[PDB]
Scaffold this active site. Structure first.
Site, PDB file in Angstrom:
ATOM      1  N   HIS A 179       0.859  -1.195   0.000  1.00 48.99           N
ATOM      2  CA  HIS A 179       0.000   0.000   0.000  1.00 48.99           C
ATOM      3  C   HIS A 179       0.891   1.239   0.000  1.00 48.99           C
ATOM      4  CE1 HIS A 179      -3.180   2.718   0.208  1.00 48.99           C
ATOM      5  NE2 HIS A 179      -3.942   2.147   1.137  1.00 48.99           N
ATOM      6  N   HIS A 182      -2.627   6.768  -1.201  1.00 45.18           N
ATOM      7  CA  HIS A 182      -3.707   7.302  -0.351  1.00 45.18           C
ATOM      8  C   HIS A 182      -3.225   7.985   0.942  1.00 45.18           C
ATOM      9  CE1 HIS A 182      -6.780   4.347  -2.349  1.00 45.18           C
ATOM     10  NE2 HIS A 182      -6.280   5.251  -3.183  1.00 45.18           N
ATOM     11  N   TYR A 184      -0.884   7.125   3.123  1.00 45.87           N
ATOM     12  CA  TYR A 184      -0.378   6.290   4.216  1.00 45.87           C
ATOM     13  C   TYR A 184       1.150   6.385   4.208  1.00 45.87           C
ATOM     14  CZ  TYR A 184      -5.236   5.533   4.710  1.00 45.87           C
ATOM     15  OH  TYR A 184      -6.596   5.741   4.835  1.00 45.87           O
ATOM     16  N   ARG A 231       0.350  -0.802  -4.976  1.00 44.38           N
ATOM     17  CA  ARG A 231      -0.677   0.220  -5.227  1.00 44.38           C
ATOM     18  C   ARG A 231      -0.094   1.620  -5.008  1.00 44.38           C
ATOM     19  NH1 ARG A 231      -7.218   1.061  -3.767  1.00 44.38           N
ATOM     20  NH2 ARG A 231      -7.757   0.801  -5.973  1.00 44.38           N
ATOM     21  N   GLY A 321     -14.308  -1.299  -6.413  1.00 47.00           N
ATOM     22  CA  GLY A 321     -14.481  -1.253  -4.964  1.00 47.00           C
ATOM     23  C   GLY A 321     -15.939  -1.392  -4.569  1.00 47.00           C
TER      24      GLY A 321
HETATM   25  C1  FMN Z   1     -15.239   1.573   2.065  1.00 49.75           C
HETATM   26  C2  FMN Z   1     -13.983   1.690   1.277  1.00 49.75           C
HETATM   27  C3  FMN Z   1     -12.836   1.152   1.771  1.00 49.75           C
HETATM   28  C4  FMN Z   1     -11.639   1.282   1.081  1.00 49.75           C
HETATM   29  N1  FMN Z   1     -10.479   0.716   1.578  1.00 49.75           N
HETATM   30  C5  FMN Z   1      -9.296   0.768   0.830  1.00 49.75           C
HETATM   31  C6  FMN Z   1      -8.165   0.085   1.300  1.00 49.75           C
HETATM   32  O1  FMN Z   1      -8.199  -0.574   2.352  1.00 49.75           O
HETATM   33  N2  FMN Z   1      -7.025   0.168   0.568  1.00 49.75           N
HETATM   34  C7  FMN Z   1      -6.979   0.908  -0.579  1.00 49.75           C
HETATM   35  O2  FMN Z   1      -5.908   0.971  -1.223  1.00 49.75           O
HETATM   36  N3  FMN Z   1      -8.098   1.500  -1.067  1.00 49.75           N
HETATM   37  C8  FMN Z   1      -9.267   1.435  -0.357  1.00 49.75           C
HETATM   38  N4  FMN Z   1     -10.400   2.001  -0.873  1.00 49.75           N
HETATM   39  C9  FMN Z   1     -10.341   2.629  -2.217  1.00 49.75           C
HETATM   40  C10 FMN Z   1     -10.893   1.501  -3.111  1.00 49.75           C
HETATM   41  O3  FMN Z   1     -10.039   0.368  -3.131  1.00 49.75           O
HETATM   42  C11 FMN Z   1     -11.172   1.806  -4.616  1.00 49.75           C
HETATM   43  O4  FMN Z   1      -9.949   2.160  -5.268  1.00 49.75           O
HETATM   44  C12 FMN Z   1     -12.207   2.921  -4.662  1.00 49.75           C
HETATM   45  O5  FMN Z   1     -13.402   2.491  -4.015  1.00 49.75           O
HETATM   46  C13 FMN Z   1     -12.639   3.529  -6.002  1.00 49.75           C
HETATM   47  O6  FMN Z   1     -13.256   2.600  -6.784  1.00 49.75           O
HETATM   48  P1  FMN Z   1     -14.849   2.330  -6.983  1.00 49.75           P
HETATM   49  O7  FMN Z   1     -15.574   3.520  -7.606  1.00 49.75           O
HETATM   50  O8  FMN Z   1     -14.838   1.100  -7.832  1.00 49.75           O
HETATM   51  O9  FMN Z   1     -15.335   2.109  -5.621  1.00 49.75           O
HETATM   52  C14 FMN Z   1     -11.602   1.922  -0.149  1.00 49.75           C
HETATM   53  C15 FMN Z   1     -12.774   2.488  -0.649  1.00 49.75           C
HETATM   54  C16 FMN Z   1     -13.981   2.351   0.071  1.00 49.75           C
HETATM   55  C17 FMN Z   1     -15.284   2.949  -0.426  1.00 49.75           C
END
Ligand code: FMN
Length: 362
Positions: A179, A182, A184, A231, A321
């Site tokens: 990771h 975002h 982190y 990522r 996601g």
């Molecule tokens: C509830 C939620 C939890 C997420 N947790 C992570 C995560 O743990 N790690 C990460 O890299 N991205 C996380 N994301 C970002 C998502 O992996 C994904 O890239 C994002 O939802 C955008 O795509 P979508 O429109 O298909 O949802 C999270 C997004 C949501 C909504």
């Protein structure tokens, strides 16, 4: 259609291009940050995904920034993940563990000894994380100002990633995803906005990427490069961490360096949830010619967009996601052009089975 055609992803072969993005859901047991049988069921329901990428998982106790997020550092965590990967494999699925350190996006009350969290620099994220109240319900709390890591603490961070990957191999994961996105810890080092260090881990892009590249090298050596994915979210702003004024050039530097290691895949998170400007085809071409593994695209994608960009040869797979939260059999639904279940965002984070395992399959 190519979404439903196999793809070799490092050491495994995905039967389709419809991947489940990493999704923090904050349902683990505390004390211990332990995955649960309920989590096992949730992932099993989604095992027709070309590849499952897990929720962000701590490499160490210090890595923790969210209450209810799981770890992959303790014996009990390893034992519980072992059951989860076994269930996915029993359903002929593949799963990668997303490994993080949250750095400054954290709170002292869930750090070891209750001390401040760590980062590249002593700058508050000026955002919130999710803790739990005395009834175990998720709550938002302002992040705690971090302490900058000492130079002599950075080897330990690299070692914690290395050890987590060794644990991942023992736990039966098919791949790991680092990771580095975002806002982190790894991204905190990559970004000039969050990294004001004057040692060799700050300043130039070479210095800012130093830590992430040490981590890649360390985990390739521990396991194998064909098991490692990463990522990144290198264009735009994420959790108040922007990518600086040379974001495109710096991103291509990092991608060229990653390519030298021969890793399984590059996963690009293209925009945060609040939006951002879309990637140009020209920038996608520049990425594509620098990286000779699988490229996964993510961020409000539709099936249509994924087909377009895979057919143009610019990406290989798409990670969804929120559609995967709400549709365990997203693959079949996309194949059949069935309707999707509606999303219930109030139960994305925390809670129990409701909003987690009760979205039906066709
Ligand atoms: C509830 C939620 C939890 C997420 N947790 C992570 C995560 O743990 N790690 C990460 O890299 N991205 C996380 N994301 C970002 C998502 O992996 C994904 O890239 C994002 O939802 C955008 O795509 P979508 O429109 O298909 O949802 C999270 C997004 C949501 C909504």
């Amino acid at each position: 259609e190519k979404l439903f055609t196999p793809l070799k992803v490092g050491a495994v072969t995905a039967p389709n291009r419809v991947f489940m993005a990493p999704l923090t859901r904050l349902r683990s047991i505390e004390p211990g940050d332990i995955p649960t049988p309920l989590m096992g069921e949730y992932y099993r329901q989604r095992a027709s995904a070309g590849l499952i990428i897990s929720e962000a998982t701590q490499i160490s106790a210090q890595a923790k920034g969210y209450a209810g997020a799981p770890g992959l550092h303790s014996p009990e965590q390893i034992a519980a993940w072992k059951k989860i990967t076994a269930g996915v494999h029993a359903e002929d699925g593949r799963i990668a563990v997303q490994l993080w350190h949250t750095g400054r996006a954290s709170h002292s009350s869930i750090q070891p000894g209750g001390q401040a969290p760590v980062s590249a620099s002593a700058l508050n994220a000026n955002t919130r994380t999710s803790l739990r109240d005395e009834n175990g319900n998720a709550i938002r709390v302002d992040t705690t100002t971090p302490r900058a890591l000492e130079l002599d603490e950075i080897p330990g961070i690299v070692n914690d990633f290395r050890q987590a990957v060794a644990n991942a191999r023992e736990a039966g994961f098919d791949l790991v995803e680092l990771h580095s996105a975002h806002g982190y810890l790894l991204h905190q080092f990559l970004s000039p906005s969050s990294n004001q260090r004057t040692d060799q881990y700050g300043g130039s892009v070479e210095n800012r990427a130093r830590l992430v590249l040490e981590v890649v090298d360390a985990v390739c050596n521990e396991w194998s490069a064909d098991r490692i994915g990463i990522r990144v979210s290198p264009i735009g702003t994420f959790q108040n961490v922007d990518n600086g004024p040379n974001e495109e050039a710096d991103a291509l530097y990092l991608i060229e360096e990653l390519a030298k290691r021969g890793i399984a895949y590059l996963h690009m998170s293209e925009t945060d949830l609040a939006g951002g400007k879309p990637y140009s085809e020209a920038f996608r071409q520049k990425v594509r010619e620098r990286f000779h593994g699988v490229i996964i695209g993510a961020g409000a994608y539709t099936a249509e967009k994924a087909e377009d960009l895979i057919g143009k040869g610019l990406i290989d797979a798409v990670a969804f996601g929120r559609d995967y939260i709400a549709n365990p059999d997203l693959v079949a639904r996309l194949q059949k052009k069935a309707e999707l279940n509606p999303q219930r965002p109030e139960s994305f984070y925390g809670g129990g089975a409701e909003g987690y395992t009760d979205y039906p399959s066709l």
